[PDB]
């Protein structure tokens, strides 16, 4: 099985223990590490932070302790407007320009492929996402003739039925990609003034109408649209989403006033890193949707929907039973990478759990 793990750039700036450089990665933990967020500029791939050429190297040296590790660079992400991507992809001059510039760049910094995080292609982009994948791959094949190993190509696809139906030709792009990472973590989305879980595994009996919004549906759906099981990779979040409540009603579907308060280290309304969740937990009440089999917590007026070792093992078993290619984990830097926040003594507890289950049969 593959264990694809994202490392994010802006996580070096976190103050204190929360700060994380490629340096922290167990070279033997994942199978592919994807460095997170390259820019595009002048229709040409390019660095994003000032020290990216340094960290790249830092990351790609893990391949010195483990010859089998492959690393990849991701274009796009959330601070890269999709409408930018759109201009690049719909416009055959600037598409070739972008594509053409990707191998020399990857090769120079020692990556093994490119991962495309086009965050949400729209209805009038499908034809072109298809054009960009198809053409990007074709170029990767042509560039292997130079006798080097073929670069890998992947994409981070959504998992909302509407999103899938609007922007992606799943059948056509699975034929060209080395693996699809299903983002099975952004469910209870941007909006709802009700509490809910962002990464439910299952449907849930207390949920008659939403049902397109859990990992099990997204997966069964992609399988039905044309993606082969051995290209699907299922996103497991290593962070938690929080809410500031608006009443003592703490239970299933209670009302909300807005996103939870920021983490002491992660500093960002709505998100909590798993390491902060470990600290939040002391003096909080835990509960667990058994239906969807994922936990939430509460303390004062904060309700936190998160993943712990047990649920992550669970999702990991799910994936093997459906025979997917493996798991994808959002943010090695969001997990307890130091190993000193969450009681027990493991380094990277969540990612370890997925690894352990993936390693077992
Ligand atoms: C990712 O890539 C973007 C470019 O595609 C960057 O953005 C900005 O890029 C440039 C760089 O400053 C800005 O253009 C300046 O240059 C000319 C000089 O001739 C000036 O005349 C002009 O006033 C600008 O200051 C753009 O303003 C801006 N372009 C846009 C809308 O993308 C971006 O910097 C980069 N991201 C990071 C963080 O590296």
UniProtKB/Swiss-Prot annotation:
Monomer. This is Chitinase-3-like protein 1. SMART domains: Glyco_18 (SM00636). Chitin binds at residues 49-50, 76-79, 120, 183-186, 241, 330. GO terms for cellular component: cytoplasm; endoplasmic reticulum; extracellular space; perinuclear region of cytoplasm. The keyword Transmembrane helix does not apply. PANTHER family: CHITINASE, CHITINASE-3-LIKE PROTEIN 1. CDD domains: GH18_chitolectin_chitotriosidase. Keywords: Antimicrobial, Apoptosis, Cytoplasm, Disulfide bond, Endoplasmic reticulum, Glycoprotein, Inflammatory response, Lectin, Secreted, Signal. Belongs to the glycosyl hydrolase 18 family. GO terms for molecular function: carbohydrate binding; chitin binding. PROSITE patterns: GH18_2.
């Amino acid at each position: 099985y593959k264990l694809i793990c994202y490392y994010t750039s802006w996580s070096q700036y976190r103050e204190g223990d929360g700060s994380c450089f490629p340096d922290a990665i167990d070279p033997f933990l994942c199978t592919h590490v994807i460095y997170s967020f390259a820019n595009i500029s002048n229709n040409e791939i390019d660095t994003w932070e000032w020290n990216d050429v340094t960290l790249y190297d830092t990351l790609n040296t893990l391949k010195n302790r483990n010859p089998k590790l492959k690393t990849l660079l991701s274009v796009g992400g959330w601070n890269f407007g999709p409408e930018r991507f759109s201009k690049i992809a719909s416009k055959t001059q600037s598409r070739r320009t972008f594509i053409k510039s990707v191998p020399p760049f990857l090769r120079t910094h020692g990556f093994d492929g490119l991962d495309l995080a086009w965050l949400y292609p729209g209805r009038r982009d499908k034809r072109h996402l298809t054009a960009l994948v198809k053409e990007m791959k074709a170029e990767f094949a042509r560039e292997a003739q130079a006798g080097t190993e073929r670069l890998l190509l992947s994409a981070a696809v959504s998992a909302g039925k509407i999103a899938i139906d609007r922007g992606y030709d799943i059948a056509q792009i699975s034929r060209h990609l080395d693996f699809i990472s299903l983002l099975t973590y952004d469910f209870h989305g941007a909006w709802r003034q009700t509490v809910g879980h962002h990464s439910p595994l299952f449907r849930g009996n207390s949920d008659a109408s939403s049902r397109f919004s859990n990992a099990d549906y997204a997966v069964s759906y992609m399988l039905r649209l044309g993606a082969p099981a051995n290209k699907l990779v299922m996103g497991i979040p290593t962070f938690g989403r929080s809410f500031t409540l608006a009443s003592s009603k703490t239970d299933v579907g209670a009302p909300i006033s807005g996103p939870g308060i920021p983490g002491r280290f992660t500093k960002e309304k709505g998100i909590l890193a798993y390491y902060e969740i470990c600290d939040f937990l002391h003096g909080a009440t835990t509960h667990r949707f058994r239906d969807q089999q994922v936990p939430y917590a509460t303390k004062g007026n904060q309700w936190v929907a998160y993943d712990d070792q047990e649920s992550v093992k669970n999702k990991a078993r799910y994936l093997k039973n459906r025979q997917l290619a493996g798991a994808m984990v959002w943010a090695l830097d969001l997990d307890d990478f130091r190993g000193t926040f969450c009681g027990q003594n493991l380094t990277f507890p969540l990612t370890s759990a997925v690894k352990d289950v993936l390693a077992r049969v």
